[PDB]
Design a protein around this ligand. Structure first.
Ligand SMILES: [K+]
Ligand SMILES: [K+]
Length: 327
DNA sequence: CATTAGA
DNA sequence: TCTAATG
């Protein structure tokens, strides 16, 4: 957590680069498990040699741990950090719609900058266009205060189109967070569960709603079960407009709500841990359901859930308010 | 780890 | 159809 930090961050630094600037899936993967093992290790790595005794720890990496250890740096690390191309890549990637494939592709064409990107909007797709459009606004955080104004308007048309709708704004928001990155609305309907063969419109109706009202301003992708867009709070009585915010809405069989709800509400660790526990408590938790375990090894048969509670009850735990779902 | 675009 | 990008 801190004793082996240098090495770990250096390494990830190492790996992240291979994956991205290079196509080195493997080396990248390599650096990963190592950085992973070196982290669990309970002692201070004093030499590569020492490290090397590990799993995943090759001669390659160990050599690296020595240099870092010996001198407070690393060249390869120092070289990469300097490398314009590589830098170039890392940058373009912040543009929503741009993954590493495009990054490189773009680079080679010689598009390395924001401006570069502009001059050639042509070369970009709608997703990337929009990402280009709101590059600033998108990198900007969501102050809860806003989160609240946003959630409000949201539950509102939801309710308007149909009363029977159940929406929830999951994530760090749901969990308290002074600010979030984007809004994650989970959606469902009684009229849609596991079997009841869809109702695409179900998703559709609402999108159109929020649109109709100018809440939703763009569409990144719209599918029959998962919308991904851009939104904005009605710029007041002037002098102050709101930044363009990313939003995601997703359909869900009423029968799989709370788990999913449970789930996306995290936190990452609360989840895992809650999940670890269901195992002992003779269960299995996963994004959609909760099944009891059968001694033979495994088992099936999804237990019925009407709320965050049943799943809690089930594993005979303490209902944790989202606020404290922290870990 | 599954849904969407796009080509 | 595949492959990329999101989450
Ligand atoms: K080894
Ligand atoms: K990106």
């Amino acid at each position: 957590e801190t004793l082996n930090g240098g090495i770990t961050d250096m390494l990830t630094e190492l790996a992240n680069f291979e994956k991205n600037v290079s196509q080195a899936i493997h080396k990248y993967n390599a650096y990963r498990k190592a950085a992973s093992v070196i982290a669990k290790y309970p002692h201070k790595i004093k030499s590569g040699a020492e490290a090397k005794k590990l799993p995943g720890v090759g001669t390659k990496i160990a050599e690296k741990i020595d240099e870092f250890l010996a001198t407070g740096k690393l060249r390869k690390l120092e070289k990469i950090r300097q490398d314009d191309t590589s830098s170039s890549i890392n940058f373009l990637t912040r543009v929503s719609g741009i993954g590493p494939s495009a990054a490189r592709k773009f680079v080679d064409e010689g598009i390395k900058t924001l401006e570069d990107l502009r001059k050639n909007e042509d070369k970009l797709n709608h997703h990337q266009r929009i990402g280009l459009k709101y590059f600033g606004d998108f990198e900007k955080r969501i102050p809860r205060e806003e989160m609240l104004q946003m959630q409000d308007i949201v539950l509102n048309e939801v309710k308007k189109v149909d009363s029977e709708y159940i929406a929830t704004v999951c994530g760090s928001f749901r969990r308290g967070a002074e600010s979030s990155g984007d809004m994650d609305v989970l959606l469902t309907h009684p009229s849609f569960t596991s079997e009841s063969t869809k109702q695409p419109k179900l998703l559709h109706q609402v999108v159109e709603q929020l649109q109709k009202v100018h809440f939703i301003t763009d569409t990144l992708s719209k599918g029959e079960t998962k919308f991904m867009g851009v939104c904005q709070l009605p710029s007041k009585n002037d002098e102050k407009e709101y930044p363009h915010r990313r939003i995601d809405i997703r359909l869900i069989p009423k029968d799989q709500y709370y788990c999913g709800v449970l789930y996306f509400t995290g936190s990452d660790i609360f989840n895992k841990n809650m999940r670890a526990h269901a195992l002992e408590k003779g269960f299995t938790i996963n994004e959609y359901t909760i099944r009891p375990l059968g001694v033979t090894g495994v088992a099936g048969e999804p237990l019925p859930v009407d709320s965050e509670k049943d799943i809690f009850d089930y594993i005979q735990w303490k209902y944790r308010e989202p606020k404290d779902r922290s870990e």
